[PDB]
């Protein structure tokens, strides 16, 4: 197994996957690494299994259809993995915890949103469709763009949104377009 957490790239108390060489901190893995389960398979392995069981699940899809899917076990897992892929980027630190807004010439957003709030919402099964999860994720970056206006710090939101959107297209097998 790897000697660092796959998500945060630090050593520490790590749990090792039995079917691939990745390792995780307890709360870096999503869902949080399970108490028992020998062997244990990480979320990367579980996602790969879905694809292997149904190769046709990788044919192209329309975003509009994906968003309307109910949050059954497989779509729940896919959103957990997409969330994890965002946390894997170090720039996710800016969007992880609850923000506050006091900047001359800007007003805070009507509906603040952050990664740990989405994490909790997934854990507590508060989304009924894929749409609910994707809307909250996109709202994080949209709030950031709006608040920071012409400050160059707005680019952090563009960067992390791009990581989200690429991973969304990959995980849910969105039809490639020009
Ligand atoms: Zn970690
Ligand atoms: Zn694994
Ligand atoms: Zn199939």
């Amino acid at each position: 197994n790897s000697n660092i957490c796959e998500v945060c790239n630090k050593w520490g108390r790590l749990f090792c996957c039995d079917t691939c060489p990745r390792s995780f901190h307890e709360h870096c893995h999503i869902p949080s690494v399970e108490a028992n389960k020998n062997p244990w398979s990480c979320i990367f392995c579980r996602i790969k299994t879905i694809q292997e069981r149904c190769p046709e699940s990788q044919s192209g899809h329309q975003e509009s259809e994906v968003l309307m899917r109910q949050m059954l076990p497989e779509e729940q897992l896919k959103c957990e993995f997409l969330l994890l892929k965002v946390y894997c980027d170090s720039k996710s630190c800016f969007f992880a915890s609850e923000p506050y807004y006091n900047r001359e010439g800007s007003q805070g957003p009507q509906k603040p949103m952050w990664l740990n709030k989405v994490k909790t919402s997934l854990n507590e099964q508060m989304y009924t469709r894929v749409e609910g999860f994707v809307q909250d994720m996109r709202l994080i970056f949209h709030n950031h763009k709006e608040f920071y206006r012409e400050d160059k710090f707005t680019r952090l939101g563009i960067q992390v949104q791009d990581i989200f959107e690429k991973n969304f297209r990959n995980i849910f097998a969105i039809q490639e377009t020009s």
Side-chain angles (χ1 to χ4, degrees), residues 17 19-20 22 41-42 44-45:
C17 184
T19 47
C20 75
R22 302 171 174 93
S41 265
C42 81
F44 293 78
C45 286

Side-chain angles (χ1 to χ4, degrees), residues 30 71 76 79-80 82-84 87 95-96 112-127 132-140 164:
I30 304 180
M71 286 281 258
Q76 179 78 29
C79 290
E80 294 163 347
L82 176 48
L83 185 52
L84 178 139
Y87 277 104
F95 301 107
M113 193 46 64
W114 59 100
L115 298 167
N116 296 340
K117 191 178 170 63
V118 175
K119 183 180 282 202
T120 291
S121 297
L122 276 172
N123 178 240
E124 292 179 354
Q125 299 158 306
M126 298 290 309
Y127 302 112
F133 165 80
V134 173
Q135 283 170 346
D136 282 352
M137 292 294 285
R138 287 171 169 165
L139 181 65
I140 295 174
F164 175 72

Side-chain angles (χ1 to χ4, degrees), residues 11-12 20 26 49 52 57 73-74 83 92 99 109 126 130 133 135 142 146 160 163-164 170 172 175:
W11 182 72
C20 75
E26 178 164 15
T49 298
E52 291 179 352
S57 72
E74 291 191 347
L83 185 52
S92 69
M126 298 290 309
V130 171
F133 165 80
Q135 283 170 346
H142 191 256
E146 294 303 293
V160 182
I163 296 298
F164 175 72
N170 176 260
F172 287 93
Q175 177 55 53

